[PDB]
A = this chain, B = another copy of it.
Amino acid sequence: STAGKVIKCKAAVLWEEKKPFSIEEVEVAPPKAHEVRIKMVATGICRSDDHVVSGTLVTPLPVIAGHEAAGIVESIGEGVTTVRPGDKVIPLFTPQCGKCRVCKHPEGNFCLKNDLSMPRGTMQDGTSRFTCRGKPIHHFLGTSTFSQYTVVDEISVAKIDAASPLEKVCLIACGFSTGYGSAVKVAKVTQGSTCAVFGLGGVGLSVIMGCKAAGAARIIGVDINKDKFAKAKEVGATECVNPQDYKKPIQEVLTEMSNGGVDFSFEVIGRLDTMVTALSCCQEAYGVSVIVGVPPDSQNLSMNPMLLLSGRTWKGAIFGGFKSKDSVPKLVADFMAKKFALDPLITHVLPFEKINEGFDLLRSGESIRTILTF
Q: List B contacts of A284 (CB < 8 A).
A: 110, 117
Kindly specify which of A33-41, A305-313, A340-348 makes contact with the partner chain.
A305-313
Task: Decide if A311 touches B108 in the complex (CB within 8 Å).
Answer: yes
Stretch at the interface among A62-70, A78-86, A236-244, A292-300: A292-300
Q: Are A316 and B321 in contact (CB under 8 A)?
A: no
Interchain CB contact under 8 A, A315 and B312: yes
Chain A, 268-295, CB within 8 A of any chain B CB: 272, 275, 283-286, 291-292, 294-295
A91-126 contacts to B, CB under 8 A, are 101-102, 105, 107-110, 112, 117
Q: How large is the interface on A (under 10, 10 to 19, 20 to 34, 35 or more residues)?
A: 35 or more
Decide if B311 touches A110 in the complex (CB within 8 Å): yes
Q: How far is the CA of A299 from the CA of B303 in the complex (A)?
A: 8
A315: contacting residue among B108, B275, B311, CB under 8 A: B311
Q: Across the interface, do A300 and B300 meet the contact criterion of CB distance under 8 Å?
A: no
Which residues of the other chain, B, contact A259 by a CB distance below 8 angstroms?
101
Q: Is the CB of B304 within 8 A of A300?
A: yes
Whether A107 touches B316, Cβ cut-off 8 Å, given contacts A101-B260, A305-B272, is no
The answer to the question of A302 belonging to the interface, with a C-beta cut-off of 8 Å to chain B, is yes
Contact A317 B311 (CB under 8 A): yes
Residues from chain B with a CB closer than 8 A to the CB of A291 are 305, 308-309
* Chain B residues, Cβ within 8 Å of A107: 286, 311
| B317 close to A314 (CB less than 8 A) | no
A314 engages B308 (CB within 8 Å): yes
A195 to B: closest C-beta gap in Å: 16
Known: A303-B300, A303-B301, A315-B314. Contact between A309 and B283, CB under 8 A? no
The distance in angstroms between the C-alpha atoms of A272 and B300, with both chains bound, is 14
Indicate whether A311 sits within 8 Å of B305 (C-beta atoms), given known contacts A108-B285, A285-B110. no
A317 to B78, alpha carbons, bound, how many Å?
53
| CA of A298 to CA of B302, assembled, Å | 12
- Min CB gap A63→B, angstroms: 20
A158 at the interface (CB under 8 A from B): no
**Is the Cβ of B304 less than 8 Å from the Cβ of A105?**
no
Specify which of A110, A260, A286, A305 lies most central, judged by the most chain B CB atoms within 10 Å of its CB: A305
A260 and B112 CA atoms in complex are apart in Å by 10
> Which chain B residues border A312 with CB–CB below 8 Å?
315-316
Q: How far is the CB of A369 from chain B (nearest CB, A)?
A: 21
The chain B residue sitting closest to A286, CB to CB, is: B108
Task: Tell me the minimal C-beta distance from A86 to chain B in angstroms.
Answer: 34
**Minimum distance in angstroms from A31 CB to a CB of chain B:** 28
Q: Could you say which of A109, A117, A315, A318 has the most chain B C-beta atoms within 10 Å of its C-beta?
A: A315
Interface residues of A in 307-333 (CB under 8 A from B): 308-318, 321
Bitwise, A186-225 to B at CB < 8 A (1) or not (0) is 0000000000000000000000000000000000000000
Scoring A residues 255 to 266 as 1 if CB is less than 8 Å from chain B, else 0, what string do you get?
000011000000
User: Which residues of the other chain, B, contact A316 by a CB distance below 8 angstroms?
Assistant: 305, 308-312
In the bound assembly, the distance between CA atoms of A311 and B112 in angstroms comes to 12
23 contacts between A and B (CB under 8 A): A102-B286, A105-B285, A105-B286, A108-B283, A109-B285, A112-B260, A117-B310, A272-B305, A291-B305, A292-B309, A295-B305, A295-B306, A295-B309, A300-B302, A301-B305, A308-B316, A309-B316, A310-B316, A310-B318, A311-B315, A311-B316, A312-B315, A312-B316
